[PDB]
Symmetry: C2
Subunit: 605 residues, 2 copies
């Protein structure tokens, strides 16, 4: 029941002062100061957070709220039909409103992602802000300040005015850009320049331990090459400068959140020190960097809302996140963050996920999964393979691969998806405002690269139940399965000694034997198994990942079923699974007669 | 973005057929059938569920949705601004629409409360229903049927039409009453008569094991006495019959959900077999039963919404839940479910919670906590004592105790809160349609019992930051603290060897030493401790509940701080706590000069 935002001028400055020193309790103390308008005033806590596409504003972690007008406490009343809105009565003749409160950041992952550690912290200004209703967020001039733990370094795209002791005062900035300008801070910090020039790019690394900061020259070069490969694709940079924020940690909550001139990224402490073991997650920075073009600068019209407290429309997330998921993996290969073999096996895993690992495609479309952020909030679901889960990411990626293959086929390889990126995102270098688009704009730009009924193509994939993996075969490769482990799966289930058996027994297991996932309508599903049941023994032998894998191989081509001793709650039973296909892991193999367009796409420019 | 529901007739019957046989996967298979009106049609999945006061409808657990009109599949489109709304186009000349889908109930507590076990199940019809938009829910005639696991018994307030094998068909009923008529089913079942007559009351017990059903005659009498004591209070029953549903289980998710003619209740398997050990939870059935009057029959006007897909206004929950919490404990004493000593120590614990255990009262009011269902959804919060948490329950209980004492003082003990209950809820015996009320109705009825400015009294308590425990002293008792354990705390910490130290060290601990709660501004809080930290040792000795309690006693009156070895994540440190007050547990003591009105209130009528 809050009035709609108005594109009207905001008089004065919204001052946000944050004390970020209580690392033990994980509390941010906040004071927000703003001109006071006589009459009923409504203050808003940001609800829909850009980049999350859902109402992730942690309203229940705002505590200790006290509001004073010219030094006098005024009682506040929350709108019971808009719990993010706080109403007060401002007397006639008033000058200034001051709101003080605390943001109680998660004390465990069960409360949300952790944002403070003994060595670092992550400040997202939307969690420490109240702003007046009735204004477009871009119309509110803001000025932020933060008091850091003693001696800590910090990094943010937002420009600093001065640091006095441990209190950093920033230059004035529009309120929407303030929310889009998060801060990392910590005691173990290394700043590396990735690109010089007029629009420079920097890498800011914070770590649990200083040893994680020892990035080698070739490792830094791959990150510098990422910026170079991005320039080749778009031909423009949508920022006056860019600040990568990377936390190498086991304590901070994982994050991959994009912004115009920065991104919040988390990685394992061995991101650099064990480069060959930590590769599966190294597409993160390429992914978030691409969003500066696709998502931040160019955004769906129904997603580009006027403030943080009106609902966002996620209908075009299969471009926002879908093509960014596509380019994140592509750019990883082009920059050297991934090897070509690593990128190709990653692609095989995605292709298998939609050919055999998503039986829920029979009833649900990828378009409907753009509602998953608001529907699920990434909360646990029983069957990610049947309920589906934000498949506008990887399912959208597969479509954009087919778009690339179709663009090549229509033009005899003279045009590709690279031409769409430059045409759709490469305009107005230096602009980091919002440039909205609609579905028709995507179709029109695609048609400008190569004439075709792109409207039908896009809708048939996003609104259909059929195959999404056509881009693999069109670009000269074929998805196959054999007993050779997938490079991603091998790395992602080793050390833990887990067992991914999605395409054989239709389940995944931990080393303990606990089932961690069950494929809908697969062999494990048809034995009544669910996640949380335990495989106790295989053919009478105590469970291990190697034991169940060897039994799958021993059952290949025979008629002797696999005998599984299963614990369901407090009961034990034995099931016989008649699976005789052996171990099956996805790979890509060349089609000899066809041109290898896939390697062209993944090749450095 | 869904059109508002209108109080217009709905032509035909909404048929809801549920297959509840897949206990292994915990899946409810659903077929919903209704007349199909040509043109655009929107189907709604219930979102706001009565009794939860929040949008708890599990939309992301609806899977496999296929909609057919006269046997022909029609594509559905979800409203991206209303994810509970499914839109289809019904062709001209059509007759019938059928929607088939599956409700994937929780496979572990992390997905929600478990609703299916090998021995029992809980069917909530809102999870297995789709209904047409544009109609008041009470205008939709519905008919439900369910196929049970072979041979299982069932219980529900809904009248049965026929059971053919294991398929139970219920008589037609208004759709809003269908959602309000849940079913328990199981293999170990006992039906116990609590009250005969024209408006009979029955207790339906389902258990993990048949041995738990051996309720003794004196135990049944206490439940029968509960019905008699409620008759004395209200003088009317708002149902044609009432069916308690009680699950004695360690497998089904806990539940306490009220309805007009039934309630969903869970207890431990030793609810009857270890009567003396399971007492702390025995106010549940009294609590839920009272809601048939206070909450179901009488409801705040802003809470009595026209369908399940418009937001609810929780502003008057301090009567709905607050006075029900009050009567739940009082009726436990009056009926014999609790002894008078147990009820008195329970009340002492509530009084201490608001005298010393709720420092968040300094900034937040009890009225604002009526927004907690939608703000928090009972998700984990760091400081329930400072953020506060649904204090319209126990904080509301204390206000109603003060209301009772004021009614007695105004009338020389000739009137009490019993007269409000009869006046406000005792009209129209047999009626179980909703009779809404506003704040002014509460004031007017209180004024009719005894003239007073009740509007100011209620607002000052619920919009204030002052003491809520004034009814204790006004009714002749005083809240005190000593080292004698509270009966509730002792029972709720024994066997597990846990340690509740809220009023000494300001924290609670598990037997492992893991801190489970920290009181804002208390001694543990002032040492930087948070929930999830571990107390490893006390004065150098490995932690136990007895060890830390003995150290608290040993520190009483001295100046030697308590040395606690603490594990915080992967670091160990020793903290010195300068607490010298000893162990402190709350109790109620008589005021010798004042009349004992409290014992009158808790005495059986
Ligand atoms: Na801007
Ligand atoms: Na009714
Ligand atoms: Zn992304
Ligand atoms: Zn209740």
């Amino acid at each position: 029941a809050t009035a709609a935002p108005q594109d009207v001028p905001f008089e004065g400055t919204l001052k946000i002062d944050v004390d970020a020193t209580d690392l033990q309790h994980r509390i941010f103390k906040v004071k927000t100061t703003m001109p006071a308008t006589p009459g009923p005033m409504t203050l808003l806590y940001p609800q829909w957070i850009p980049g999350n596409h859902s109402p992730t504003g942690p309203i229940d972690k705002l505590a200790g709220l006290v509001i004073k007008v010219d030094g006098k406490v005024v009682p506040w009343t929350r709108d019971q039909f808009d719990v993010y809105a706080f109403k007060v009565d401002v007397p006639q003749g008033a000058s200034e409103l001051v709101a003080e409160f605390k943001f109680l950041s998660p004390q465990a992952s069960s409360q949300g992602r952790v944002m403070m550690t003994p060595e670092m912290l992550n400040l997202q200004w939307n969690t420490t802000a109240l702003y007046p209703a009735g204004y477009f967020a871009r119309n509110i001039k803001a000025q932020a300040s933060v008091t850091l733990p003693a001696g800590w370094s910090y990094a943010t795209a937002m420009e600093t005015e001065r640091r006095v002791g441990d209190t950093v005062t920033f230059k004035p900035i529009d309120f929407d850009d303030l929310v889009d300008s998060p801060m990392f801070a910590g005691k173990y910090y290394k700043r590396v320049e990735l690109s010089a020039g007029k629009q420079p790019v920097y890498l800011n690394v914070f770590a649990d331990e200083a040893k994680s900061l020892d990035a080698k020259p070739e490792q830094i070069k791959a990150h510098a090459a990422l910026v170079q490969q991005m320039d080749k694709l778009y031909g423009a940079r949508h920022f006056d400068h860019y600040e990568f924020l990377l936390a190498l940690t086991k304590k901070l909550g994982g994050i991959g959140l994009e912004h115009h001139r920065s991104s919040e990224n988390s990685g394992a402490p061995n991101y650099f020190t064990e480069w060959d073991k930590s590769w599966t997650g190294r597409d993160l920075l390429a992914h978030e960097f691409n969003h500066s073009w696709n998502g931040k600068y160019r955004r769906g019209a129904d997603l580009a809302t006027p403030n943080f407290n009106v609902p966002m429309g996620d209908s075009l997330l299969w471009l926002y996140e879908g093509q960014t998921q596509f380019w994140g993996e592509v750019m990883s290969a082009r920059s050297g963050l991934w090897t070509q073999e690593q990128a190709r096996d990653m692609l095989a895993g995605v292709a298998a996920q939609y050919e055999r690992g998503r039986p829920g495609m029979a009833w649900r479309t990828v378009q409907d999964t753009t509602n998953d952020p608001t529907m699920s909030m990434r909360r646990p679901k029983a069957y990610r393979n049947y309920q589906m889960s934000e498949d506008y990411y990887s399912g959208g990626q597969m479509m954009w691969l087919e778009v690339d293959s179709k663009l090549r086929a229509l033009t005899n390889n003279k045009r590709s998806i690279d031409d769409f990126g430059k045409a759709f995102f490469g305009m107005k270098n230096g602009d980091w405002d919002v440039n909205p688009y609609t579905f028709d704009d995507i179709v029109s730009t695609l048609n400008g690269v190569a004439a075709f009924d792109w409207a039908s193509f896009l809708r048939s994939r996003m609104d259909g139940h059929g195959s999404l993996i056509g881009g693999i075969e069109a670009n000269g490769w074929k998805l196959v399965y054999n007993d050779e482990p997938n490079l991603a799966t091998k790395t992602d289930e080793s050390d833990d000694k887990d067992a991914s058996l999605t395409y054989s027994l239709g389940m995944s297991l931990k080393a303990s034997g606990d089932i961690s996932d069950v494929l809908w309508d697969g062999p494990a599903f048809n034995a009544g198994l669910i996640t949380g049941n335990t495989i106790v023994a295989v053919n009478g032998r105590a469970f291990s990942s190697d034991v169940i894998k060897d039994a799958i191989t021993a059952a290949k081509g025979t008629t002797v079923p696999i005998e599984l001793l299963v614990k369901r709650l407090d009961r034990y039973d034995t099931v016989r699974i008649d699976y005789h296909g052996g171990l099956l892991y996805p790979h890509l193999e060349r089609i000899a007669g066809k041109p290898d367009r896939l390697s062209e796409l993944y090749k450095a420019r």
